[PDB]
């Protein structure tokens, strides 16, 4: 491998430079219909997915996996990864979800799509939780990588994935020790961060279910790439 040789400072710089760009929404003069808001979200997700693959390939250890393992991990965590990115962008905008710099939504916009307010409330709760925890960008890129490797690990090669997961854990602890936190505060914060991933998984399952209902309704056009990512969960 090559990720196991990296120092924790090198691991951070590798992940920071691997960050995908912030894409703009295709929006403008639209009070949102239920079909227009979901169109923006799915269109943004489809274009964000293209950058996620290049980001995943730049995650230390992901290139060492077989093509099928890479597909399986991405097929399981893609919506989690999009959501934790949305949650991260929305930190400095309390009560608002920054889907894009030109697409800032609150929970009232969630009422424009049935079943969306519940997902909105959960996303806002995670974002406020990151705000209270004072989540740093160095920590965020570690959590996003952990989601990628961990979410599909339970469906030799897995021994390497767990070895890379240990490395990112070491990197998280290094970041907290570098910030002046005590040893007790280090494992406490590590525990607080990883327990949020359980809820990110929960929101993904709720959102994955909501996306399936949009398909059977077929009012919202879904890209073939998006349909294939969706068919991998059911």
């Amino acid at each position: 491998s090559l990720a196991l040789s990296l120092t924790a400072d090198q691991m951070v710089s590798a992940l920071l430079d691997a960050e995908p760009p912030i894409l703009y929404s295709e929006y403008p003069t639209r009070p949102f219909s239920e079909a227009s808001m979901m169109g923006l979200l799915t269109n943004l997700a489809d274009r964000e997915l293209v950058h996620m693959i290049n980001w995943a390939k730049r995650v230390p250890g992901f290139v060492d996996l077989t093509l099928h393992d890479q597909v399986h991990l991405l097929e399981c965590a893609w919506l989690e990864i999009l959501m934790i990115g949305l949650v991260w962008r929305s930190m400095e905008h309390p009560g608002k979800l920054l889907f894009a710099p030109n697409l800032l939504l609150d929970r009232n916009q969630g009422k424009c799509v049935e079943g969306m307010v519940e997902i909105f409330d959960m996303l806002l709760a995670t974002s406020s939780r990151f705000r209270m925890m004072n989540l740093q960008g160095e920590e965020f890129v570690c959590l996003k990588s952990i989601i990628l490797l961990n979410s599909g690990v339970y469906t030799e090669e897995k021994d390497h994935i767990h070895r890379v997961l240990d490395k990112i854990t070491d990197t998280l602890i290094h970041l907290m020790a570098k910030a002046g936190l005590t040893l007790q505060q280090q494992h406490q914060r590590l525990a607080q961060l990883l327990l949020i991933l359980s809820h990110i998984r929960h929101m993904s399952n709720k959102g994955m279910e909501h996306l399936y209902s949009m398909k059977c309704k077929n009012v919202v056009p879904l890209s073939d790439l998006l349909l294939e990512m969706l068919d991998a969960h059911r």
């Binding site: 995943a56 390939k57 093509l67 597909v71 991405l74 073939d224 790439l225 294939e228």
Partner: peptide
């Protein structure tokens, strides 16, 4: 799969 082409490219 489309995901296959994206990972390889």
């Amino acid at each position: 799969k489309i995901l296959h082409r994206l990972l390889q490219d």
